[PDB]
Write a protein that binds this ligand. Structure first.
Ligand SMILES: Nc1ncnc2c1ncn2[C@@H]1O[C@H](COS(=O)(=O)NC(=O)[C@@H](N)CCC(=O)O)[C@@H](O)[C@H]1O
Ligand SMILES: [Zn+2]
Lengths: 482, 472, 564
RNA sequence: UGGGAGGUCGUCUAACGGUAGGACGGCGGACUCUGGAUCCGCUGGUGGAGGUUCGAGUCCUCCCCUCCCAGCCA
């Protein structure tokens, strides 16, 4: 509350494509033996040229859109020159000037208050391969091993303004980001398998600000619960600052996932000179207006408006909708279902309770379980017709979500037709007290569902059936002359 | 007929029995001729030819900076010899896929970088007629084992006129299609923007015939997108009614006397077929080479960044990595290359980018734009391919020299611009020919103006300028 | 426009050495070369879109499929050097019957301390399950932490247990075909089977700093010969692979974990001993164990163990993570607490068969009588009756079932059980008539729950020097009517023919009538003078198996204790 | 923080979706003798907010408490 932190992070992203990045090798190469996904091109052999993968672009635009990014009609490819055993070409294909999509913003549920966060650039990169030293991590020995399998897998590197305030807004910024992409179909976003990486920036001075305080940067730190407790730490020590005579200065730190700390530098692959020129091996990428309004209709409805729809556009309450729109598969099976029985009102409840239940008391998603809308359509028109109490129509509902059997079918078998006929409910309910007077006596004084006992009697004695409405009407009156 | 000389088209048809000896008696004549001229770095073992394809039997040779599965590609540079190909450059794929049988990998400058051939770190390559002189260009060894007659035709990269130069200076026909017509995939590229694999042949009918085989878009080079281009059909059709164009500082240096002389013939020996050899003055073209020597060795200091002892080729067994890279890239590249990869990294450095580089990258749209619409009042431009006879085995140790010995070649690159070099001389007793620039991406037309000269010119008997008789 | 430093920032950027020879050699014609370009300065320094490529600016980008290169092999037989597939580079018509695995459980305590009522249920569980399914009970001391352990704690962990009546068919005290049954007795095996996995792509070695066994140095899958004699430490860790690990669990249903949550973990200490998780599996496998029934504290551990099993390629056992018994502070018992230890409840008076009663009852489906032997209980036993919650230990309930128990058995029994209790506690009882004590027992028992109670209450029937309660005096002797009564009392008794039970109740059923004090205050002086304690068995039994002899005495030697 | 497992009187344990009971503790009594024995009566609970239902401890969503694994502890 007293001191104000400004955080901004860099993010890399592995896109879940097929064809790699500038060639025709598979780029989903995790459990793959070393150098089995090599090709003359992505391996930097002499006389090899890069061929822009379409899919790599499709994916970028999707995420650019979701991120509310002013895209870019025109887009150039560039060469980021530098040497390292994990990087073949002697350079890397990125997009310094002309990122396919500039400037945007992602809104966070915000473990704080509901906030917006400004995107800066949003370009594409190639990504080098695994370099492992002779048995060790942040260190050294005698020889390192290169595994190029990963060389040339479509990367997207999103950079974001120093908006973020809380080391939580950070966690949830990337919690949002994964939970977006694990969705539109453009990445697994799962930091663990190095699919979502990130570095970060921090600062502080007064209480009300005039600028910032220049960064610090925290490369290295997988895990989300580890980007928090580590930007957490890079704050507990930034306060013992101008609160002990000290400025907020430069240097860069990574974080030991063992202890719980952070360090300065030792490796020394510094902020050299990367010489960014345009990639003559590739002619510029110009995105068809006449095509692109065709991949804004490709990308799926995000679960926030999929609600806004159902909401004031299907009659469903904020609550009812909000629930239905999680399991996107379920959200589909709602409509798949409404289509065939244009009463959403009831469809909701049923899938929210009875249905969503067996999708749990046995693990599954609607997706494959013998339950077509033709079951509700049937169930329904049948309660509609009064051959079935909303009770019985809940009693039967498992044997149906089990046997596939059509509702109206399993009723023609156990004979569950709502006997609200003759008031022999009048009859059974009398004998009900003859042989149970402690109870009637109880309702003679304790009103609260005391007849609830008799309700149950009539049911037990007629198989589910009776008729809630009618059976109750009767009882609450035969408890008036005792 | 002596095979030492034999257009592809004479090869066209000579009996199923008679013509199957053409491969063998091509390596056979190599064992003899070669040791003197020294133009081949590989030369096949003894593999043989079958059938399939209009143009079989016909033995070819191709510049050793051009990946050729089956036989070490080496760019004639210590760092990259000893490297077995891993894929047929598409030009070679398309060649073999047609009938052609490649024989050996022809020498060249180190990484196609220079303007003579001696700069090759494997060994110098001597000009067929006059082992004292030099083939010139970058793909010298190519355009010299063709002249000498060890092979029917060759392929060669052209970055600063690297097929034209050595063709005019060595005696034969070198063509440079427009940047966008021949796959650069499989060409160990030195500059990505300018490079282009072209033929090198005896008839200007083959320079035109090779194209219609070694071309088409390729999905392995995203910079070759298609175009409706014909190198034949209008071939034999003298420019009997076309306006032309000529440079200006073309006469403002000091062309070797014997040169512009047997050149000024091209003027009238064309006007004799009836065509305006008028002139126009282009300004900023004045720079070109100064502009091409920013861009090119800039692209080199990254196109070559890849040869690092890391994964293939040469490697100096040094205990540290910071060592290994350097001591390998030093003892490997060496010579000319070295200094190019240097000035280039410097063109792209911290406080020089928009200064030197980007500027040059814009001047190349200056010269590009000017040269261009000049191809939009009338047809072909033109110039002597060479500004010199064909210098002697030893050379003024001065890079600047070579780096100028072009001009006539450079600007065709700074637009792709098609450009042939057809012979029409013998001057100072070293057969230098002329060049015929073309409209950006407008080819066929230059393959008309070519044959035009090649016949309607003194010296050339049978229709094809003579070939150097070789000590054997 | 001409320098010597450019050598750094330049020949360093294209990583190009330049032996002292060709040094100032470059500069020469690099200077000229640089100079010539200056013939550029004559240009347009504003608005002029650059050209890096001719062409017609599109891209036309591949929509194709993923394809493994048609000749990957040449790319790789073209490397300078290689290790395990990587590029290596400079550091910087007769049949037979079918046998079904036979039933076998383990109670695998670690001698880290005293056995509590915790390990007692979770052991009786295994015990019963074996005794019901007709199988075998195995008992294994797991002492891999050589500080946290002991041969006393091990020694006392078997006693408490032998007391609860839990015979094991195989243990460290009488062997079994699967010896040995301590783990420190089998480092023979772990390092064996551990290297059986560093053979495989599955475990690896880790070396540390000589003078700080914290920080990690290297790794390769090969034994650090050199380093282990140069005096460093080495652990073996298990290479967790990516994937998902799961299992059924008779109590906790289907369970699944994935291993992107389980980081590479130590399975062989610096000191030749296993880590817990590895140690089991091996032993748990070797010891042919069909069912593991253990502490819920171990669920989150059945993955790590299940990885191991499926890397040795071994069939694992059924699992069954039972809940803990907690403390009064919502939390599991342990070595820590130490105040809820079987030993305690033993000498504190609780009868074995009653602990086993409550332990077989704390959080079990009640079903029927609440009081029972662990034999009776057997014939109605499903390891599924157990509830899922961590119950809290409730001495109140224990002592209750304890009491109901002694009062319900044969008299001889409690006798033996009392006496043998006497020793272990160490109260020192001065036995007497082999059938008088066997009568003041009969009486004393009916009024007390434990046995430290059946001792205190039995107390003044033997020892004749019994105290008097710093409280009985307070409202009965310091009373004004006292001597008057204890006195009339003495004669009312001193004059008593038949001393049986009938005309013994009567004796007092009138000392009351004559109004010395209230029926109450009288009856309780008589009592509280002949026993010393306010509450005792029924006064008509006490003064009857004391004798006119003793009652007169005790009646007397307080009439003197009244003094002043 | 993640992953896991639990959540009905003070403590354990019950209630086809139909009056939330039983046991132990506790409080009050009774037993023409105490009570630490025995009997008897009472007290006292579904963690929270909503949804489905005639009816919810039981079915659905979210939230809250507790415990476990995250060990060169086991
Ligand atoms: N509070 C508690 N209440 C009720 N049971 C408890 C308990 N605490 C531990 N236990 C269970 O008692 C058994 C032995 O505990 S222990 O001595 O710590 N030993 C061990 O945990 C391990 N040596 C054995 C684990 C295994 O079964 O594979 C183990 O099964 C353990 O889970
Ligand atoms: Zn590839």
């Amino acid at each position: 509350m007293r001191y104000r932190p400004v955080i901004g992070l860099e993010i890399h992203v592995q896109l879940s494509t097929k064809t790699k990045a500038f060639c025709s090798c598979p780029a989903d190469v995790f459990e793959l033996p070393p150098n089995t996904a090599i090709c003359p091109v992505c391996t930097g052999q002499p006389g090899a040229l890069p061929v822009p993968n379409e899919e790599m672009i499709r994916f970028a635009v999707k995420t650019a859109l979701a991120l509310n990014c002013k895209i870019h009609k025109y887009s150039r490819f560039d060469r980021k020159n530098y040497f390292y055993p994990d990087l073949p070409k002697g350079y890397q294909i990125s997009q310094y000037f002309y990122p396919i999509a500039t400037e945007g913003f992602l809104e966070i549920d915000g473990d704080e208050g509901r906030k917006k966060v400004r995107i800066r650039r949003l370009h594409l990169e190639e990504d080098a391969g695994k370099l492992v030293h002779e048995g060790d991590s942040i260190t050294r020995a005698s020889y390192s091993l290169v595994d190029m399998n990963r060389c040339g897998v479509p990367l997207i590197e999103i950079v974001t303004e120093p908006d973020i305030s809380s080391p939580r807004e950070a966690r949830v910024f990337m919690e949002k980001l994964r939970s977006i992409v694990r969705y539109l179909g453009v990445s697994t976003g799962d930091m663990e398998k190095g699919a979502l990486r990130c570095d970060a920036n921090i600062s502080v001075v007064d209480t009300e600000t005039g600028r910032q305080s220049n960064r610090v940067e925290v490369k290295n730190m997988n895990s989300f619960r580890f980007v928090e407790r580590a930007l957490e730490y890079e704050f507990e020590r930034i306060v013992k600052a101008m609160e002990r005579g000290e400025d907020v200065e430069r240097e860069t730190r990574g974080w030991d996932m063992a202890t719980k700390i952070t360090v300065s530098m030792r490796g020394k692959e510094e902020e050299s000179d990367y010489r960014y020129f345009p990639e003559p091996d590739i002619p510029p990428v110009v995105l068809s207006d006449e095509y692109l309004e065709e991949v804004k209709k490709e990308l799926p409805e995000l679960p926030d408006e999929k609600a806004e729809r159902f909401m004031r556009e299907y009659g469903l309450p904020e609550y009812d909708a909000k629930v239905l729109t999680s399991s996107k598969e379920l959200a589909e099976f709602f409509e798949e279902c409404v289509k065939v029985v244009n009463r959403p009102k009831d469809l909701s409840n049923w899938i929210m309770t009875e249905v969503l239940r067996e999708l749990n008391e046995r693990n599954i998603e609607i997706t494959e379980s013998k339950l077509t809308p033709q079951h509700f359509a049937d169930l329904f028109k049948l309660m509609d017709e009064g051959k079935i109490s909303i009770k019985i129509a809940k009693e039967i509902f498992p044997e149906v979500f089990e046997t596939g059997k059509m509702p109206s079918q399993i009723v023609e078998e156990k004979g569950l037709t709502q006997i609200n006929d003759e008031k022999l409910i009048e009859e059974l309910v009398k004998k009900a007290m003859e042989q149970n007077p402690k109870a009637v006596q109880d309702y003679k004084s304790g009103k609260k569902k005391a007849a609830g006992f008799f309700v149950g009697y009539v049911m037990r004695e007629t198989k589910g059936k009776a008729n809630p409405e009618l059976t109750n009407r009767i009882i609450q009156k035969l408890l008036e002359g005792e | 007929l002596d095979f030492r000389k034999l257009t592809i088209e004479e090869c066209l048809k000579l009996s199923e029995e008679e013509r199957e000896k053409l491969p063998q008696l091509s390596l056979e004549t190599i064992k003899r001729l070669d040791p003197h001229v020294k133009a081949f770095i590989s030369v096949r073992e003894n593999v043989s030819v079958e059938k399939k394809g209009k143009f079989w039997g016909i033995p070819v040779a191709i510049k050793d900076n051009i990946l050729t599965l089956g036989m070490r590609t080496t760019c004639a540079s210590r760092i990259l010899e000893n490297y077995e190909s891993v894929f047929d450059a598409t030009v070679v794929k398309k060649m073999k896929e047609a009938g052609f049988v490649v024989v050996g990998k022809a020498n060249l400058d180190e990484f196609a970088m220079g303007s003579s051939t001696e700069r090759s770190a494997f060994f110098p390559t001597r000009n067929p007629w006059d082992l004292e002189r030099v083939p010139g260009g970058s793909s010298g060894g190519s355009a010299a084992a063709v002249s000498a007659g060890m092979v029917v035709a060759a392929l060669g990269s052209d970055t600063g006129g690297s097929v034209r130069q050595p063709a005019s200076l060595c005696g034969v026909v070198g063509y440079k299609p427009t940047y966008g017509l021949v796959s650069r995939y499989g060409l160990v590229a030195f500059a990505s923007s300018l490079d282009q694999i072209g033929p090198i042949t005896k008839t200007v009918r083959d320079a035109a015939i090779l194209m219609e085989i070694i071309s088409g878009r390729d999905e392995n080079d995203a910079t070759t997108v298609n175009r409706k281009v014909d190198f034949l059909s209008e071939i034999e059709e003298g420019v009997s009614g076309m306006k032309f164009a000529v440079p200006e500082e073309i006469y403002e240096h000091d062309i070797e006397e014997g040169v512009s002389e047997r050149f000024e013939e091209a003027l009238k020996l064309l006007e004799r077929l009836g065509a305006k050899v008028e002139r126009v003055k282009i300004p900023h073209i004045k720079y070109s080479v100064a502009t091409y020597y920013v861009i090119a060795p800039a692209e080199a200091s990254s196109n070559l960044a890849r040869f690092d002892g890391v994964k293939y080729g040469l490697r100096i067994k040094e205990k540290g990595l910071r060592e290994m890279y350097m001591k390998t890239r030093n003892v490997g590249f060496g010579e000319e290359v070295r200094r190019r990869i240097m000035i280039g990294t410097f063109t792209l450095s911290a406080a020089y980018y928009e200064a030197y580089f980007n500027k040059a990258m814009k001047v190349r749209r200056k010269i590009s734009d000017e040269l261009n619409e000049v191809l939009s009042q009338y047809d072909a431009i033109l110039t002597p391919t060479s500004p010199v006879t064909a210098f002697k085995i030893g050379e003024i140790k001065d890079p600047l020299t070579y780096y100028l010995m072009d001009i006539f070649t450079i600007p065709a690159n700074l637009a792709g611009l098609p450009a042939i070099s057809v012979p029409f001389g013998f001057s100072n007793n070293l057969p230098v020919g002329v060049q015929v620039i073309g409209r950006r991406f407008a080819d066929g037309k230059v393959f008309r103006i070519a044959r035009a000269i090649e016949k309607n010119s003194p010296y050339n008997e049978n229709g094809m300028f003579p070939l150097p008789e070789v000590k054997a | 426009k001409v320098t010597k430093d450019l050598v750094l920032h330049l020949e360093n950027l294209a990583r190009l050495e330049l032996s002292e020879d060709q040094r100032e050699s470059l500069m020469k014609d690099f200077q000229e070369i640089l100079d010539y370009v200056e013939l550029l300065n004559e240009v347009d320094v504003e608005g002029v879109e650059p050209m890096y490529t001719p062409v017609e600016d599109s891209a036309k980008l591949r929509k194709g499929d993923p394809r493994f290169f048609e000749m990957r092999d040449l790319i790789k037989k073209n490397f300078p050097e290689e290790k395990d597939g990587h590029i290596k580079v400079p550091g910087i018509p007769k049949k037979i019957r079918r046998c079904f695995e036979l039933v076998r459980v383990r109670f695998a305590p670690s001698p880290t301390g005293h056995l509590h009522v915790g390990g007692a249920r979770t052991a009786l569980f295994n015990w019963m399950f074996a005794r019901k399914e007709g199988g075998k009970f195995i008992l294994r001391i797991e002492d891999t932490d050589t500080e946290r352990s002991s041969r006393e704690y091990e020694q006392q962990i078997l006693e408490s247990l032998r007391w609860c009546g839990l015979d094991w068919d195989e243990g460290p005290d009488i062997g079994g075909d699967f010896g040995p049954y301590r783990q420190s007795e089998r480092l023979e095996i772990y390092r064996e089977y551990a290297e059986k996995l560093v053979e495989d792509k599955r475990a690896y070695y880790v070396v540390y700093d000589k003078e700080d066994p914290s920080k990690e140095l290297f790794t390769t899958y090969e034994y650090p010969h050199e380093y282990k004699e140069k005096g460093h430490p080495v652990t073996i860790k298990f290479k967790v692979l990516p994937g998902k690990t799961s299992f059924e669990d008779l109590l906790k249903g289907y369970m699944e974990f994935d291993n992107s949550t389980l980081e590479d973990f130590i399975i062989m200490k610096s000191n030749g001993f296993p880590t817990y998780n590895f140690a089991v599996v091996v032993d748990d496998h070797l010891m042919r164990i069909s069912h593991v029934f253990r502490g819920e504290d171990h669920l989150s551990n059945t993955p790590k163990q299940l990885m191991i099993y499926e890397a040795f390629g071994w069939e694992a056992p059924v699992f069954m993570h039972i809940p803990l018994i907690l403390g009064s502070d919502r939390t599991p018992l342990s070595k820590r607490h130490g105040a809820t230890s079987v030993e305690h409840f033993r000498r504190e008076g609780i009868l074995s068969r009653a602990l086993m009663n409550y332990l077989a009852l704390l959080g079990w489906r009640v079903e029927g009588d609440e009081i029972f032997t662990i034999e009776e209980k057997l014939q109605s036993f499903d390891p599924k009756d157990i509830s899922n919650k961590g119950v809290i230990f409730d001495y109140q309930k224990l002592e209750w079932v304890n009491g109901k128990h002694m009062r319900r058995i044969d008299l001889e029994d409690l006798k033996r059980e009392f006496i043998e209790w006497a020793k272990y506690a160490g109260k020192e009882i001065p036995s007497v008539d082999e059938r008088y004590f066997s009568e003041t027992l009969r009486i004393c028992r009916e009024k007390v729950n434990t046995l430290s109670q059946l001792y205190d209450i039995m107390y003044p029937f033997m020892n004749d020097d019994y105290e008097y309660e710093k409280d009985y005096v307070e409202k009965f002797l310091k009373r004004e009517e006292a001597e008057r009564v204890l006195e009339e009392a003495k004669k009312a008794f001193k004059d008593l023919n038949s001393w049986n039970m009938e005309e013994i109740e009567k004796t007092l059923r009138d000392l009351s009538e004559k109004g010395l004090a209230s029926k109450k205050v009288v009856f309780q002086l008589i009592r509280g003078a002949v026993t010393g304690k306010l509450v005792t068995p029924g006064l008509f039994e006490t003064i009857e198996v004391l004798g006119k002899e003793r009652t007169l005495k005790r009646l007397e030697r307080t009439l003197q204790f009244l003094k002043k």
